[model samples]
Target: MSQFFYIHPDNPQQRLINQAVEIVRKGGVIVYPTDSGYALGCKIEDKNAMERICRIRQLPDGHNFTLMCRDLSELSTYSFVDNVAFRLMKNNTPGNYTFILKGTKEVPRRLLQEKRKTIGMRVPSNPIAQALLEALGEPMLSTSLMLPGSEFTESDPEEIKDRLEKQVDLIIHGGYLGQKPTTVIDLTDDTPVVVREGVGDVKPFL
Candidate 1:
């Protein structure tokens, strides 16, 4: 059975955040809220948790996994970022956008896209997510919690609990949210390519 926490959306309780981070540290898969929607997250190095998420989401081997970072500096530590891309991301992040870049040695090999050797990373504005990332002190390997055969990312924690209770370790309820994932921008090349338009405004990246 999974533990469910009703966390404040604007000001998350620190004690709960600390406990949630501890669960992540112990290699547990968790359902947590993000700027875009709810997501599945686990410690960066936990392969078993990642596999569990893959099973729950019915994701294929080539799915592009993402890292949820506390800030842009933290994101740069795991992915290569050029000056132009840095400026673009600096102005636009902490919003609803995912940036894809070449993975550094810090990122696990299996997490990288096999052909491009890239990984997706994001810095979210959601306070609960921000608190979790800050408490974790490192990126949490994450992917939007879009269930199999679903067209939208999971938004309601209660609905998510009903579907994923026994499958995950914890569920952090940061209030109900919209059903959209982050807009994906590919920054591995000289030009920033808008891969998928979802939540963030694409004008700046264009």
Candidate 2:
């Protein structure tokens, strides 16, 4: 069963954050809240934990996982951020946008898009998420928490704990819950393509 932690949304407890990071480092899959909604998170190097997430989300073998970064600088390390894409992402990031860019050598081979060699990256604005990333000291491999056959992402902490206790190792109650996902944009070509539009504003690109 998953351990539950009710971390404050605005001011998270340091002790709780440390414990959560430890769990992540030990190859534990966690259900945590992000700016868009709850997401399933695990260490980038944990293949088994990653597979557990795939099973939970019922994702296909080649599904793209979003690397949750602490900031744009951290995000660029995993992605090939050219000048144009950098400037554009710098202005709009730390919000609800997921940018798909070519992966760098630092990215794990399995994490890259099989055909395009790209990966999804996001820098969330939420404090709990920021605290987790800061404590973890690395990018988190994350995907939204919507279950199979469900149209929207899961929200409520109680319901989430009840549903995912056995599936995940931890459930972080970070306070904000929404069904929307971060808007996804592909930056492989010179032009940005809207792959999926949700909570984030897409008007700037369209």
Candidate 3:
């Protein structure tokens, strides 16, 4: 059974935050709340945890996962964000948006697809996520918590906990989350391309 941690959506309890951090530190896969929706996450560089997440999500081995950063500063470390990209991200981030940028050498090669060296990066505005990042002192690997054949994102924490209890190591009940997923934008080229339009407004970047 998965460990259920009932943390306040905003102003998460310090004990809960520490427990979540410890779980990630040990390469445990967790189902947690994000600004956009519920997501499955783990330490960014943990290969074993990555495998577990992929298994739980039923995603392919080469699937690209988003690096959930605390802020733009942490994002710069793993991806190459140009001046325009930096400004755009700075203005719109800490919201429900995922920017696809060219990955730097800092990213593990195994995580990259074939010749496409790109990674998704986002800064969630949710407090549970913010607290987790603060305690972890780094980003976490994240992807939407939608199961196969499901078009809508899950919003019920109890339902998520029940479904993922045996599949994931930890379940953070960070209150209810929005039903929509993050708006995904590809910043690999000179222009930003809308990969998927969801919760975030893309008018500013377009």
Candidate 4:
């Protein structure tokens, strides 16, 4: 059975955040809220937890992966960021955007896209997610909780718990984080490329 937590979206308790991080550290797969939606998260070093997420979601071999960062500073560590792109990304992160860039050596080999050796990274504005990342002190591999054959991302915490109880390690009720995914941008080139338009504003990148 998966553990359940009702953490406040705005004011998360430290004790609870610590416990949740502990679970992630111990190779546990968790469902947590993000600015655009709820997502599956696991430790950077936990391949078991990562596999669990893949199985649960029925992800294809070429499925894209993203990691959640506290801010651009943390994101820069795992991705190659030039001075030009850095300034552009600095102004728009911590909102609702997933920026794809070349993965640095620090990023796990498996997390990088097979074809391009790229990885999707994002900085969320959610309080609980921010708190959780701060407590963990490391970026987490994450993706929206869009299970197989589903047209939309999962938003209802109760329904998520009911369906994923035995499949995942924990479910955090960080309130409704909407059902839309973040806007995806390809920052690997000189000009920013908008890959997917979602909750985030696309005009800046355009």
Candidate 5:
């Protein structure tokens, strides 16, 4: 059975947040809101939870999950970021952007992109995600909740509930959001490459 939470977009209910964290701690995959849109989140160390998410999304074996961090401080823990890349992320983070960097030992090997061994990291500005991350006290292995046969990131929480209720463990209805996903930037090397341009501006990296 799945649980649903109508967390306030602005003022998140810590009670619900605690319960959601509890579910994640128990290796449950959750659907939560992010700065970009709704995303699939599970504890970083939970391999079973990760596998469930892959099945839900129909992800390939080598697909990389983004490490949803509470802040930039967690960057070094999961990926290697240089002074230059750090400054770039510092200015643009907590917004709609995903930075790809070489994965560190702290990251689960399965979450790393197979050959490149890179991982995507993001610091979300959404209140509910921030609260959840704070309560969980660790980065969550996450991916955009773009269901199969759909091109855009899932935005309507009600629609997500209707569709993913049975597939996931917890669904946080944090209000409808734009369908745009984060602009992806490759920071694994000295030169930054704009992998995909979505809502975030690419001029900063150019």
Candidate 6:
């Protein structure tokens, strides 16, 4: 069974955040709330925990995962966002949006696929997620809480806890997550392509 912690959504409890961070550091997979929806997260370098998350989510091996960062500055560290991409991200970020960018060498080898050496990156506007990122001092490997066979991501906190309690190591129920996942924009090519349209409006890119 997974441990559960209910933290403040607006002002996260520091002790709880620290405990969550420690769990990640010790190679634990967590189901936590994000700005767009609920997400499964683990430390970027924890391969075992990463595999566990992939298995639970029924994600294929080559599927790209997201790096949840605190801000744009942290995002630039792992992805190569050109001037155009940077401007677009600056305009639309801190919301429900995922930007797929060319990955840099900083990205772990295991995280990239052969045909696509890219990764999804996001800066969530949710205060709880921001608090976690700020306390951890690094980007977290994350993906939506939609299980295998589910068409949409789960949003209700109680449902998420009930479904994932035994599967994940911890559940950070900071508050309710949005019903939709972030809109994903692929900027790897010369043009920006909308891969998955969700909560964020991509009209500016279109």
Q: Per-residue lDDT for 40-134 in model 3, tens only?
A: 99987899898887777776544567888999999999899998899889889787899988877878876665566787898999889998999
| TM per prediction | 0.96, 0.96, 0.95, 0.95, 0.96, 0.95
Which stretches of model 6 miss by more than 4 angstroms?
none
RMSD of 6: 1.3
lDDT (C-alpha, whole model) for all candidates: 0.90, 0.88, 0.85, 0.87, 0.89, 0.85
Residue range 1-206, candidate 5, lDDT tens digits: 57999999999999999999999999999999998989999998989899898888787555567899989988777789899898999899787998989888999788899899998898899899999999999899998889676657999999998998989999999999999889998986788998878778999999
lDDT of 6 by residue, 55-147 (tens): 887886666788888999989998998888988888887868989887788879777655788888989898788888888899998888886
Error of 5 at 110 (Å): 1.4
The digit string of per-residue lDDT tens for model 4 on 32-114 reads 99888899999989888888887877776765788899988899888999976798798887868899898999998988999
Model 1: per-residue Cα lDDT over 1-206, one tens digit each: 99999999998999999999999999999999998999999998989998888788787666688999999999999999999889999899786999989889999998889988988899989899999999999999988899777768999899999999989999999999999888998887779888888899889989
For model 2, where is the 10-residue window of minimal lDDT? Answer: 57-66
Any runs in candidate 4 off by more than 4 Å, and if so which? 149-151
- By summed lDDT, the worst window of 10 consecutive residues in model 1 runs over 54-63
- Candidate 3 matches the true fold with a TM-score of 0.95
**What value does the lDDT take at residue 68 in candidate 2?**
93
Each prediction's number of clashing residue pairs:
0, 0, 0, 0, 0, 0
Model 6: what TM-score?
0.95
Q: Model 2, range 55-106, lDDT digits (tens) per residue?
A: 8888755567889999999998989999879878988888689999988998
Scored by Cα lDDT, where does model 5 land?
0.89
